[PDB]
């Protein structure tokens, strides 16, 4: 099996950390990330090795700053190429509330600050429009959903209040019943759907009415490749499912999916039964976590001393995921 690739990324201090005069307890060198314990400075710092240890603590003017472009060119680009080979792929962002999950996956729409999802979509349509072999034709379908307190909402159709039911097809696996799947023929169109979708996510008074730290966003692309040949006249089809996930903060029930995800990752890392069905998230992502798929995790890290316990936990879960191997 192909190992689930893992990258961790540390961001610059945020307003909260700055207001408390937080010092940085994270260091990086090569693919290694080291964390210092602010409370017990007497211990030896804990080190972890990953596929990538992204230092994005400073700013683009730094030669060593890990940009949106590097993060995408390493893992995003690799997964898209696998999609073209016909493999199902998945990338999920994991980490403590405010560590930088949405920035990594979505980013912002200015300044070359766009994240993995916008860059991959753009790259996808660019490659398709660069085609010169008329025997090849393509189809791109998109779906975007939110998972909040186990409830699934269609972000491309906020015009319906049904909490879509996650089901298990008797032969084809899990799916979200009646989730809209829209055909898109340009990057501009897909971006427009992405934008309105981002506008439909649940917000929380508790988060100063910002997007709720407890909702999961799953962005799916169904990429179909049709290859003709004037001969016998059969067109062959290659279908790849691209799943781009932006998880709720790692720190019918509020934290079921996240706690269950932890258990699934731990169990898989150990095994190499698994509670996939214990949560809607792990259920829908069953094949991406141990199944027929090329998967990658990007763990977001706060650099601050005040978030030591949470950051250590993220590093430890990312270390375990690194041990998972899917069967493709």
């Amino acid at each position: 099996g192909a190992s689930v690739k893992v990258a961790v990324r540390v961001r610059p201090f945020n307003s909260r950390e700055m207001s408390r005069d937080s010092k940085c307890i994270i260091q990086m060198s090569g693919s290694t990330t080291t964390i210092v314990n602010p409370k017990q400075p007497k211990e030896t710092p804990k080190s972890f090795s990953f596929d990538y240890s992204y230092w994005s603590h400073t700013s683009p003017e730094d030669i060593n700053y890990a940009s949106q472009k590097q993060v995408y060119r390493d893992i995003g680009e690799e997964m898209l190429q696998h999609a073209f080979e016909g493999y199902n792929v998945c990338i999920f962002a994991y980490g403590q509330t405010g560590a930088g999950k949405s920035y990594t996956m979505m980013g912002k729409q200015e300044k070359d600050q766009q994240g993995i999802i916008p860059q991959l979509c753009e790259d996808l349509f660019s490659r398709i429009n660069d085609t010169t072999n008329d025997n090849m034709s393509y189809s791109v379908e998109v779906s975007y959903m939110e998972i909040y307190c186990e409830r699934v909402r269609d972000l491309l159709n906020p015009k319906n209040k049904g909490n879509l039911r996650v089901r298990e097809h008797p032969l084809l696996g899990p799916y979200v019943e009646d989730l809209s799947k829209l055909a898109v023929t340009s990057y501009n169109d897909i971006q427009d759907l992405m934008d309105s979708g981002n506008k439909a996510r649940t917000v929380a008074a508790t988060n100063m009415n910002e997007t709720s730290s407890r909702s999961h966003a799953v962005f799916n692309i169904i990429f179909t490749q049709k290859r003709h040949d004037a001969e016998t006249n059969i067109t062959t089809e290659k279908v790849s499912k691209i799943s781009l996930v932006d998880l709720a903060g790692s720190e019918a029930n509020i934290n079921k999916s996240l706690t269950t995800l932890g258990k699934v990752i731990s169990a898989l890392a150990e095994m190499d039964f698994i509670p996939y069905r214990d949560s809607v998230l792990t259920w829908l992502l069953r094949e991406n976590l141990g199944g027929n798929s090329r998967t990658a995790m990007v763990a977001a890290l706060s650099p601050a001393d005040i978030n030591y316990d949470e950051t250590l936990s993220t590093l430890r879960y990312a270390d375990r995921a690194k041990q998972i191997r899917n069967t493709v």
Partner: protein, 427 residues
């Protein structure tokens, strides 16, 4: 004037309240003074003015009461020994009581854990200088286990000076809950490290040995177990408070038994256990009383102290006997117990005497101490925790209450080293 704060929580705490306190219109309760000098009265009060300050001494019952599921309301409030008092009573309005540390502690308790601030404030004020914070509490309580640590934490936070005295209830090889492994482990990190100064143990699995060996009882009882504890508290709380030739104020309690900062836990005994009938053996002896104060069999806790060495031993005897007699006898304990004495430490045993023997024993013996043994009481809940809650995990229940990998992992590692650090003494 060394007045006193009564906080009673959960089941074990509220009910335990029932049995500590009633041993008090025995009259001394917590810091007035007087009364108890020429009998008289009874109940849930006397003649004056209320509120509060008549505390645990003349016209009033002072306590802070904390119930989180209206069990302590009805169980005692009414027909029973009290009034209590009004205004001094918490009923959680149905919170629904919770099993789970995180649950009244993080959840319903916060909301009440704030309403418990008002109780503490009014008592604190009383016009007397308060030196105790007395709290009953339950490993596996959630309300008590994780509400008691909330209550404890603010009280250490706001009352650093005033060492907390907390009564404990524990895990012994027998069980309540299944979540009590970890429930009391999280009740821990907070009971060490949470301004709780000294810490009492009251294992119910050890309480029986006592109520049934020493005692005969034919069929104990949870109310009868409440006779036991009163014993262990009156010595500490009444004794030394109530009059006395070497008198140990509660604070002697925190330097005598803690020899260091992490929450020193103790085990405590009452000898004068007696047998109704057997009533006739050793006229309230000292050796009698010393004898019974160390045995493996007379400790009213879930550690059997014999495995290891105690580190600190605080004993208290209030029978009207020789101040020469008690001190001369306690030595003999110390010399056939070497290995039970901590090589550091001299004066491995402190002795206090107060001047009135418990109403109707004639002569009393209270015991306190920490030995190396407890590396036990925990190397048991931790084996429990790692393999339980933290294990293949049991906290979905708690996982909604609001604690996520934390309060588990931190409670094992912090409470763990407890095991190593504790051992450290005398390996």
């Amino acid at each position: 004037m060394r007045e006193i704060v009564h906080i009673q929580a959960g089941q074990c705490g509220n009910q335990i309240g029932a049995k500590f306190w009633e041993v008090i219109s025995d009259e001394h309760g917590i810091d007035p003074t007087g009364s108890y000098h020429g009998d008289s009265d009874l109940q849930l009060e006397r003649i004056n003015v209320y509120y509060n300050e008549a505390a645990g001494n003349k016209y009033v019952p002072r306590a802070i009461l904390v119930d989180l599921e209206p069990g302590t309301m009805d169980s005692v409030r009414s027909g029973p020994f009290g009034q209590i008092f009004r205004p001094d009573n918490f009923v959680f309005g149905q919170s629904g009581a919770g099993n789970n540390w995180a649950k009244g502690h993080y959840t319903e308790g916060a909301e009440l854990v704030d309403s418990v601030l008002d109780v503490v404030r009014k008592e604190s004020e009383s016009c007397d200088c308060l030196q105790g914070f007395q709290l009953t509490h339950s490993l596996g309580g959630g309300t008590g286990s994780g509400m008691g640590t909330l209550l404890i934490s603010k009280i250490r936070e706001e009352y650093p000076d005033r060492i907390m005295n907390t009564f404990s209830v524990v895990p012994s090889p027998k069980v309540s809950d299944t979540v009590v492994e970890p429930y009391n482990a999280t009740l821990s990190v907070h009971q060490l490290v949470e301004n709780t100064d000294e810490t009492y143990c009251i294992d119910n699995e050890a309480l029986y040995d006592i109520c049934f060996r020493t005692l005969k009882l034919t069929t104990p009882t949870y109310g009868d177990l409440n006779h036991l504890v009163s014993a262990t508290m009156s010595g500490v709380t009444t004794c030394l408070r109530f009059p006395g030739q070497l008198n140990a104020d509660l604070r002697k309690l925190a330097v005598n038994m803690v020899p260091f900062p992490r929450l020193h836990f103790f085990m405590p005994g009452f000898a004068p256990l007696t047998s109704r009938g057997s009533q006739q053996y050793r006229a309230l002896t000292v050796p009698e009383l010393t004898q019974q104060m160390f045995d493996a069999k007379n400790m009213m806790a879930a550690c059997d102290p014999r495995h290891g060495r105690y580190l600190t031993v605080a004993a208290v005897f209030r029978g009207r006997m020789s101040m020469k007699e008690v001190d001369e006898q306690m030595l003999n304990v110390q010399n056939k117990n070497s290995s039970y004495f901590v090589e550091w430490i001299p004066n491995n045993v402190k002795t206090a005497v107060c001047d009135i023997p418990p109403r109707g024993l004639k002569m009393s013996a209270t015991f306190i101490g920490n030995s190396t043994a407890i590396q036990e009481l925990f190397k048991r809940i931790s084996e429990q925790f790692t393999a339980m809650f933290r294990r293949k995990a049991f906290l979905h229940w708690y996982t909604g209450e609001g604690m996520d990998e934390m309060e588990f992992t931190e409670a094992e590692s912090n409470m763990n080293d407890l095991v190593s650090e504790y051992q450290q003494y005398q390996d």
